[PDB]
Structure formats: structure tokens, C-alpha cells
Write a protein that binds this DNA or RNA. Sequence first.
DNA 1: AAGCAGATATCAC
DNA 2: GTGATATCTGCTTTGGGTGGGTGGGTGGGTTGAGGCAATA
Lengths: 254, 639, 565
Amino acid sequence: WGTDVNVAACKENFQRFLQRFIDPEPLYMQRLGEINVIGEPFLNVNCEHIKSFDKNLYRQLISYPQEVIPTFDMAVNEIFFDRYPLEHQIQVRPFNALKTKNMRNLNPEDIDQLITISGMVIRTSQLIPEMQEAFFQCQVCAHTTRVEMDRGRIAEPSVCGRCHTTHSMALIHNRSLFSDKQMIKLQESPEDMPAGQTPHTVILFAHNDLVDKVQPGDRVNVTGIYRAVPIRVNPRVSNVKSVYKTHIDVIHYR
Amino acid sequence: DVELREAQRDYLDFLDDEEQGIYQSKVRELISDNQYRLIVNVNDLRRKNEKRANRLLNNAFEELVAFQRALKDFVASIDATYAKQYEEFYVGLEGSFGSKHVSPRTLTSCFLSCVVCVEGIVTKCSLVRPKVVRSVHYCPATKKTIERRYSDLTTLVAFPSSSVYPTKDEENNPLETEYGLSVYKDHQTITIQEMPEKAPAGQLPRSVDVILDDDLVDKAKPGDRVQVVGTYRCLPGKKGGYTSGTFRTVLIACNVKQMQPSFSAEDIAKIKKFSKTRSKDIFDQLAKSLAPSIHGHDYVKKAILCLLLGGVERDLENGSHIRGDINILLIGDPSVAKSQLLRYVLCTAPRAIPTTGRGSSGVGLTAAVTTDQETGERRLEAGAMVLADRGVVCIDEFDKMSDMDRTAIHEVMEQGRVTIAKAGIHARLNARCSVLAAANPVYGRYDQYKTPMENIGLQDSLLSRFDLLFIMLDQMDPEQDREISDHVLRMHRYRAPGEQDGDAMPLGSAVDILATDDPNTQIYEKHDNLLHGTKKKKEKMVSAAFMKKYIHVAKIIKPVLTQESATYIAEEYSRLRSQDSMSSDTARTSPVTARTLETLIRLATAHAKARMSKTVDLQDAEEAVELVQYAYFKKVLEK
Amino acid sequence: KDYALEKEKVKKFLQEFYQDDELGKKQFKYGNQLVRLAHREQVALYVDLDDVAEDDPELVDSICENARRYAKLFADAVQELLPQYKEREVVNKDVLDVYIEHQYPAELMRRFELYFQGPSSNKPRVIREVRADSVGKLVTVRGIVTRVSEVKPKMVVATYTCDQCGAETYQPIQSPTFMPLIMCPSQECQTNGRLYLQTRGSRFIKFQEMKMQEHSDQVPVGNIPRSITVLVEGENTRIAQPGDHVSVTGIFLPILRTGFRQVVQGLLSETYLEAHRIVKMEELRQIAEEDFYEKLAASIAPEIYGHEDVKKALLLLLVGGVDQSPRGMKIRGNINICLMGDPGVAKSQLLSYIDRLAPRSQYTTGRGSSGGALVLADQGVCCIDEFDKMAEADRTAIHEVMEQQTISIAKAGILTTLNARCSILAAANPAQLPAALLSRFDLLWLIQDRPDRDNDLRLAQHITYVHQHSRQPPSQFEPLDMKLMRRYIAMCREKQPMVPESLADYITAAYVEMRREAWASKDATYTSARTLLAILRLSTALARLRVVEKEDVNEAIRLMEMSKD
DNA sequence: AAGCAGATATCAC
DNA sequence: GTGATATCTGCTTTGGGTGGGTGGGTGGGTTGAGGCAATA
Ligand SMILES: Nc1ncnc2c1ncn2[C@@H]1O[C@H](COP(=O)(O)OP(=O)(O)OP(=O)(O)O)[C@@H](O)[C@H]1O
Ligand SMILES: Nc1ncnc2c1ncn2[C@@H]1O[C@H](COP(=O)(O)OP(=O)(O)OP(=O)(O)O)[C@@H](O)[C@H]1O
Ligand SMILES: [Mg+2]
Ligand SMILES: [Mg+2]
Ligand SMILES: [Zn+2]
């Protein structure tokens, strides 16, 4: 991977951040205590605090959110389990208090980076299930298998292990494991619009507990990762267009 | 093979004619004017080699290929560099083709692979698109270039070559296209439709599809009347290894002609002498000569002459605009020849679009959206008033148009522009036309005891947009009845010299033009006893052809207003506007406004044009004032 | 031709071309930019072909005939020269550089762009004159931008990594579509893996698509304007907006089809223009110092005669009044005027003038368009001609704009609000418009032309002169040109004058005087509480021309009472 | 041109 | 010598009007003009 990210060093740095940072008892130690009291396993962290304590950790968080955030989760989980011997492990949600970008100025250089934008919600979709683990059953011997999804691709078994028959494993859709996804359309704020131009719109994708957290009409600051995805020419071919489409993977709503 | 070589030899012999020199000189001119199409007259070819002409007209594609090869060789002989300049040289045909003169109804399968000349109206045009002729590719690794040739069913030598460009060499090394070294030619498609007057009874006109390539692109636009010389071919196609056996047919054009006067020195001298002969009588004579078959409505004819001549439009340095087009409205009782005057203008004016109030819509008047034949692109098609740009629109049954449809005419009538804001299209179309409208009063027959405003039944703004309004009344007067009856019966007794007694006009007609140039001027029409009567002939009639040439020449002049004319016009405008109840019986047909002053200026300028004068003088202003005085007031009878 | 000699010649031009700078008088125009590109303080290099023409016109001809080839040649020359012009290390390394540090195609390391600035000898064309003989050549085209797309990422080089052997594969892309790679081509995987696209190792570029249109004055008689598609990349993006007049230098190319659509389609192709350069198209104090309000008002449509006070009112609508309260709270400054009168009194001419003068404006007719112009006129002026010919739906939209300065739309229950902060200038012919609409206008001017000999004589003398000379008759003070009038209007608009405490009592005294007259008149005047706010709005507009003073209130009062007659 | 269905020759054990 | 498994061959695809309106608009395609019922 083309990243100057050492997982162990990042985890140690973030644990140090939770231990020592003081809001101008560490603030996030109090937050973890409140998490234990309440039971909601979500820790919101202000990126400005991380910047103040450590400028390298902030720079790495902004440049490589996908790699760095899970290490933050590991650090918070370890620290929390030390201080207090929960349905799920705690998940960090870094956010920026103010927008760092305008919807009109998103650029290719921002692809796969953590950004914050302000806008007004106009539409939200119904829930979309995403397969996480597939369930297979042999159509001869009824032997069952489970396969983990890997980058949107599944490795369908070719031969049953128990009876060795070939091409006998059928995917049972409703025995698989699914997670939630939601499509949201964010409209550019009236204040930031240049005079006489139609508003711009952006697509956001929310997952798991962030689905249904906003409704049409809301005015929100969204922190998330900017993504670029290829577009197929038609559903049948594997040809793609040279111009990519974009969306934002939501990490935090305000 | 041998026949092709012999044909090429014959054609080369034909173009090398210095030993009368017409085609040697034509090719030299082609070189000088930077052209790559030579128009050949088949009459000369027929004179010099009859068999070669018959083969050319009956086996068109092979013979044209040989002809173009010979032309390229001859051009190379005169100048080799020029020959290298152009990929191919084309041959166009003109003259008399005998039975090959057809219409879209008579163009049948028996003319396949033949040269034909079709006459019709252009109904549909397409966008110009490039078509690849030769492709050049370069190999960066191996540093060599390869060329490819393409052809399709539409080329002279039909072959269905592959459209896919090469991407790699026989060796795996990749290839890149040299677009600036390749060759492309313009390509366009049009439809030509049978002339409605020629169609048989009860039949909607037929149409044919034509392909224009290279220079021939954009030679014709919808609404034109054209003569296209080309070759007739069928385009057979297959799908899944199956053919229906029914094939589309196309005309591949080699020449396009329009059907702009051409002036000889003698005609120019005649026009100059006619202008010089009289000072005041030119306008009156021209107006008297306009629509001979209608018994006099003298002021209306003068107004129509002014409309045909027009004014001078002003463009100001700031960018403001003042129109020069003159609009006329005629409201009248039944059967006073309003529609006949409109039809005369339709038949005589260079660009005239007919329209009926009940048969037209705002969309059809201005412009329409639809999907492009190719790609399904939202495109615009011109309406009546845009097709009439720098022309005339004749609207009959004006009072029958819907109010919403009528409102769309205001902007064109005043500003001359059409604003299209629909289907994701934002355009400003030029519709700079003169409106000639005819209407009936609200009660059908004008009620003299009611006021003009109550009879006309139109809003003051629309009336203000008309330069002149004429109330034409049918008053039973025994002397006027005698005169009109004599004129009408003389018209109905007339029989054209060619026709025999008892002949009936046929419904429809076969193709009558047998050449591209008509095998068939005098100032005054020859006297005919029925057309003109037995009167001593003191008043002479200007002929139609001379009138068409003279009006064309006069429309280009731009008279300049002078101080004396301006003073007279200002004083007369003040008198017209101030005068309230100038006659107690008298009532105003239309309100007097600054538009009336602009109308006075326009009419004076048109009058000065008729004299071919460079300045507007007092006589022109007096004539304009007389016209406005006649038009703007009407006596109201008291019971 | 052998392209190695051409590349050497291009390098030579880039290296030893020097031009007389304004101050230095001898500077290397492109060596400095090469230094900047090497250090990455610059992205796009624009080669002016006039400079190349100075040295060797033949190379300029070659470039113009086969531009897409020479673009690559120049880019290669620049890429080869960059190392030699580098002095110091790059201060900041972004994600791509970190990926690089942690064979490569030559275009993966490229971070600059090369464009041509067309020669001055190549005069511009209209979209019609760009024909098949121009395919692959460098041309300059003029038009109006009608549509622009949001900037999007386009892939230039796709980078893959094999999960098994961990090698890297590269796929340069030069087509509107491409075929992604799947299976690793490395020897190790071949002797015995799946490829996956790495967005961090790939190179993207900013991409934009726009449509251009022909100028109306250039369309031939009885024709419809044509349009061309312009594809914009890199540093040429975000320059053009809908409505601007642009001159685009670029390369005329056909659109490549892909897949089975190559086979089905014949020898015909769609075209586009590949954009290379997009170009958009104390005496002054003394004019401002004395009688400047009278001079500016008289300069509105000088070819029109006699509407002195109406012209003064229209100037106020242009400056527009103060937008903020004394505490910074937003308040409505836009001034709405309606001109009601009988036909042929220059209402449409005055509206047409204001549209041309206003920087942002839209002219519409009662029936020329229905069910959009208001949005494009935000922060501008919306001239509504034939104001009494509109439908109820159009009337409701105008009513809501004069109230909330926004436009609300509902797409099958999906609501949306658009900014409509625009001034309304309406023209109508007296018959019957609803009173709820007429009371919203700050100034309701009834233009009545009663015939009178001397005035009609004077008007005729003016109009005849304009027809005689195509300009207004001379006067003691010369009207100011539009170019110069739009400067003062913009300059005045920057000020934000405020109304003092002291004037409160005086403005109040004027309001009751106006109210008393309205009750005494017994006519259908619309003097209400709304009138009081109108006095302030006009008073601040008058000051913005010249802290409000008693003289601005006097002018505002006089202008309004003259309107109610 | 791109991809699935069918046919079939071919390595390996 | 049988079971994969790798190679090769032929089909048909696209949305499109020469493939029909005697397939059907619950299989899917802007723009305008033209009949209805309810409307005022
Ligand atoms: N003054 C006239 N001179 C010659 N022919 C005339 C004259 N008046 C009427 N006619 C003839 O009588 C008929 C009048 O029909 P026409 O359509 O011209 O009348 P109109 O005024 O347009 O009527 P409407 O308002 O009913 O349409 C035509 O045959 C026309 O040729
Ligand atoms: N005072 C004037 N000075 C100069 N030109 C004038 C004047 N009044 C009218 N005109 C001219 O009269 C013609 C008609 O003017 P215009 O079309 O602007 O009138 P309008 O008030 O908009 O009419 P309508 O109500 O019929 O739409 C234009 O050429 C305009 O130049
Ligand atoms: Mg009639
Ligand atoms: Mg008007
Ligand atoms: Zn099994």
C-alpha cells in the first residue's frame, strides 16, 4: 500500500491522545465513562483536538481515513476495556466542526480523503441490504458452507466438501448475513451558491447505525470519505466509462 | 474492364478540347477558383459522342467513375500539385436528360442505376456530419505509418467496409491515429417532396431521399424549390443472415440547382431609363400594374407596393433597433378581393409564406422541437414566420386566429425576433418579415352606422402594430357595379393563346421542364382586348417580369431622409395627432401614436425607393401623408 | 516526417526563446515556467503560437494541421526538460508522490498540462464553418455557453496490484471507455492472481463537458443556430458558465464509439471540440462630483424622448437600495417598478435598454415563456413585458418572488427552494391586474400620452433626427456609453449607507401627508403601511448614487408623488 | 466487439 | 482408460424504426395537436 502508515505507531499515538488530551480528567476519558453509563458504543472525536495534540496523526487521518480509523477503534476498545472491565465494540467517528470544502470545489485530489461539507437533505432512499457473508447449501447432500464477501466478490464453491459433487452448491439468499445501506441526496446550501446558478447536488451513502439519522429538509454538516466508482457502459458488458462517478461514505452527521 | 478503359479514354478525349476549348477553360477556372467539382453539360457530350452519353445516362456509376478518373488525369496534366491537393475530383451534370426528368411520383424502379433530374420542394434537412474517407495511423515503436480506405453502400463503388479503426500492427506494437493527416468529407441527408400543385386529385405528395456529400452540403434548406441531378440506387441490407428483399432507395446527388435574378447590361439600362423617364408617375404606374385581374382598390395597391419595397431598418450604436418592415391589415365585407390580393403577393414576392388563422398555431408560426433523426437530439425546426425571415407572411382569416395564437405574433410584428425557451432550449430566432393580413369585421358585414373600433373588434395594441389598416366596403353603386362587372366578365371570357376552345384544366400535370436551363425583357405588357378592354389604352401596364426585376433592384437602395422631408413629416404628424373630431362624422380607425410617425417615415422611404432616389424628398413625404390620411379615418353615417 | 527532429526543434524553442519583458527587457518566457513546473508551483503551460511563428512559421503550420500530434511532442519535450531545470526539492508531497516513493508509463509521473494559444493569424470561425476539412486541426470558435457540467474525475492511467505476487500493472487510457484488466500478467503468476484497481496509485484529471451555441446575429437568413460540444480538462475547468460569451481554441475531433456500437454504426461520426484555451468575452471623479444624478438618468436610452422622471426611477432600480438593516440584519432592498400606459410610449424600448445595461438580467414576454428566467436573474433584474398577458400560474410565481425572494418547486411532493433575489420591472397596457399584485410595487407609473401640438412637434423632431443620423440629436451634455455606465453603477452599489435616528420624525411627517392625500383623492391608490418602507428603500438608493441626508428624502418623496399622478 | 452456451480435444492420474 | 478442463465455434447482441402495427404497451422511447368530459 502506498501509505506511510505504521499501524502500531498510529494505535499507540491515538491511545496517547485519549490518555493525555485536555479540553482547553481527560475529555475523552470522561466520554468513555459516559459511554459505559449510557451504553451507546460511539465515540465522537473532534479532528481539531487531534490536530492540536499531534499534527502527523491528523495528517494521516485526513489522507488515509480508511486505514487509520480502524486503528483508532482498536485503541479506544483496548483503553476502554482496561478502565472498565456492550453489544458491540466502540467505534470512533471523527468529525470537523465546520465544513472544510464546498460541494462545488471537490476535486480528484480529494479522492479517498476525509472531508466535511454542509448541505440540506432533499431525498432519502429506502433501506438497501448488502451481503456480508454468503450461505451455500449442497443441492444433493444438504451440506452447508459460509463464505465471507471480499471486495464485492464472492468465491462460489465448486465442489461439495462432504459429497464431492461438482456444481451442487446453491446460494441461500435468506440464510446469508446482510447489513443496512441508505442513499441520501444532499443539496448545496443557499448561502454558498454563486449568484444565478442552480444548486449542486451530492450523493451520500450511510451504513448501519447512520441510516435514517437525517430526514428531508434537514440542514447538516456531513463528514465522510470522498469516493470515485466506475460506471459500466451497459449491464451485460464489463466495459467501463473513462469518467468516474463520485459519492461520499458518511462517517459523521451534525 | 476494357469497356472501362475505353470510357476513360473517351472522357479524356472529350475534356481535352483546345483543338473550341470550353472544358479546357472550365478546368482552368476550376483550378483558379479552388474547386474540385466540374459541372459538365450532357448536351455537349451528346453532340461529340452520342453512345458515350447514352451509356453515362443509363449506366451511371461505372461511367461516372471513369469520368472522374479522366478528370483527375486531366487536372494533373494541367497542374500536378493541385491534383495532389485533393483526394478526388467530382463531375456534375446539367442539360436535357430526355425521359430522365422526373418528379418524386414518377421516380420508379425502372430508373435504378440511371442519371435522373428531380424537381421538388425541400421538406427535411439534417445536420452535417463528417464521414471518414482515408485513415492514417502511426506506430511509435516501429516508426512507420499505415493507411486505410473506407467505402459503403453510398459510395460510387459500393462495398461494405468495416468501420473499426486499426489499433495494433501485425506485430503487437500499438497504433495511434493521425487525425490531421486523415481525410473526411461532409455528409448530409435531405428529403424532396412533390410540388402540391402537381399532385393528382386527392393524393398527398410523394417524397424521395437525397444524399449530399462534399461541396453540395447546405446547398438547400427546407422550404426551397430545387432541381437535383443525381444517380438512383437501392440500399440492400441484411440482419442475422436474412434479407427481406424490399430495399430503400436513395438519390445520390451530383448537382443541386435552385429554382436571385440575373441582370444583363441591357436590363440594367432599361431599369435606369425607366427610373429616369418620369418623376411622379413611376410609383402610380407600378401600383396600377400590381394585380391586373382585380378591378381597382388603388390606395390598397399603393400600400402593397410600399410593403414589397419596404423601409430601411435602423441599427443604433447603442444597439437599439427600429424596424423597416411595413405591416398591412385589410378588414372588409365579403367578396372584395382581399384573399386575391394576398394570393397575388404569395405568387409574386420572392419569399412569401401563406397562413390561415384557423389552420395555424403559435408553434407552427414560430418554431417546433423534435428528436433528431440521428441520436434523438432535441432540435429546432423553423415555423412560418422564421421561414419568412426577410420575406412576407400572408395571414388570411386573421380574425379567426385564437387569442393565444394571436399574442405570439406581437413580438415578431414589432421587434422581429422570436424567443424560444422550451424543452431545454434557449434561442433567439430572426423573423424579420412583413405581415399582410386579411379579416372580416365582427358582424361579418361592416355596419356603417357603428364606429370603426366597434366593427374591427381588435385591441388597440395589435392595431397599433399595423402600419396601415384598410376598411374595404362593398357599397352597391350602379356605376361601380357596371365597371366591376365588365372587368370580371372580361376576365372570365379570357383564353390563353396556347389553349384551344373547349379545353378544360387538368387536375394534376406531368413534368413539363425538360432542361436545367429554360429553353424559352419588355417594359410594358402587350395590349390584349379582353385583359385590358377596348379603351384607348392611355394608361399602360408594366409587365410582370420587368416589375420583378425593377422591384429587386429598388429594394437594395437605402434612401436618406432630408431636412425638408423631416420638417414636413413632423408638422404633418403634429396635425394628425392634435386634430380631435377633425370631421364630426369622422372617427379614427386606429390611434395615432409615435408608431404613426415611424410609419410615415417608412412609407416615404419606400416611395423614394420606387423612384430609385438616394434621398427622401418632399413628394415622397406628401405621398406617405396622403396614404396615412386615407387609412386612419372613416366617416360614420347617422340614421 | 521524422518526429525526433521535430522534438529537438521544440526543445530548442522552449529553451532559447527570450522575449522583452515589461521591466527586465530580456527574459526567457518558457524557461521560467519550466522552472516553476519542475518545482510544482505551476500546473498548466500555455504555448503561444505567435512566439513560435516569430522563429519558424513552418512549425506553426505543422502544429495547426496536426495539432493532437504536436501536443504530445511538446509534452514529451517539457517532461524531458523538467529534470534539467530543477533546483531544489519539492516542499510538499501529496498522496500520489507517497505512492510513487513507496515499468511506470511516462504519463503516470506527469503532473503538468500543455495547451496551445492559437495564432493571431487564424481568425475565429462560427460553429458552421467548422467542417470536415478541420478534423484534427487547431481552430478558434466563438459562441455562447448554454450548458456546463459539474467537474468530475476522468482516469488517465489505471494502476492495478496483484494480490498474490504483489506486482504493479499500469493501463494508460486514451478513449471515452476502456477495458479493465482482471488477471495478473506477471511471470510469477503466469508460471504457476486477480488484479484490483488502486485508486491511490492511479492518475485522474478534472473533466468537464459544455455546449456552445452560435450568436443570433451570425445565423444565416431563415436558419436555426447550431451547437458544438466542448470537452474541457485539467486547468481549463471552472472557467465557463452558462450564458457567457467565449472564444474556444481547441482541436476538432470525432467521437470514438466502443463495443458492438462500432460495428453497427457506419462511417459517420459525431464530433466535439477538445478545449485548449477558453477566453471569456480625476475626470472620472469630476463626472461623479457634479449634477451626476441628472447626468446618469438622462443617459438611459437617449434615443427615447421625454420620459425624464421615469428614467430617474429606473436608475434607482439599478442601484437597488441598501440590503442590510443598521445592525446587519438582512432586509429587502430590491425596488419593483411597473410601467402602465397606452400603446407606443416606449415601454418595450425602455425595458430592452435596461436588459442590455444590467450586468445580470433576463427579458421575458407574457407568452414567450412560461413555467425559469427568475432564477437566472437572481441578484439581477427581471424585465417582464406584456405583464397583463400572463397566466395565473405565472402570476403566482411573480407574487411570491416580490414577497420571499425565492422560488418554490414541488417534483411530485419533493419540495425545493431556489434563490430569486431579483428586481421586477413590469410593463402593462391598461384594459385589470389584481390589486394584491399592484400594491407590492414601490413605484406605479401611469404613462399617459395626451396629444398636444408643441410636445408632439418636439417628439417628432427628435425621432426624425434619429432616423436621419442613427443617433440622438446633440445636447449640451453628452450621454455616457454603456461600457462606462456599468462601472459607476457597480461602484455605487458597494456603499451601504444607513438612515439616521434624526430623520425618523421627518420621514413620518411625509408619510401622513401622503396618506391624507390618498384618502382625499378617492382614487384606487395603494398608499398603505408598505409605502413607509418604500420611502426608506428609495432614500437609501439615492444616497448610494451620491449616510442618508434630507436631500435624498426630498428627492424620494418628489419622485413618488409624481408617480401617483 | 464481448460474452455465454455448446462442442470437443486434451492432459493427468 | 475416465474425469475434469482447457480450447475452439456459433449465436446474438444494440434498442429501431426496411422488423410489424395482423405482436403488446404490465416489456420500453417530450412535443405537439386533437378529441372527450367536466368545466366555467
Ligand atoms: N374588385 C374585384 N375585381 C375583380 N374580381 C373581384 C373583385 N371583387 C371580387 N372579385 C372576385 O370575386 C371573388 C371574391 O372572393 P375573395 O376570396 O377574393 O373575397 P374576400 O374579400 O377575400 O372575401 P371573404 O372575406 O368572404 O373571404 C373572387 O373570385 C374574386 O376574384
Ligand atoms: N418618446 C419616444 N421617443 C422615441 N421613440 C419613441 C417614443 N415613443 C415611442 N417611440 C417609438 O415607438 C415605437 C414603439 O415603441 P414600443 O414598442 O417601445 O412601445 P410600447 O409602449 O412598448 O407599446 P405596446 O404597449 O404596444 O407594447 C418604437 O420604435 C419606439 O422607438
Ligand atoms: Mg377571403
Ligand atoms: Mg410593448
Ligand atoms: Zn454435497
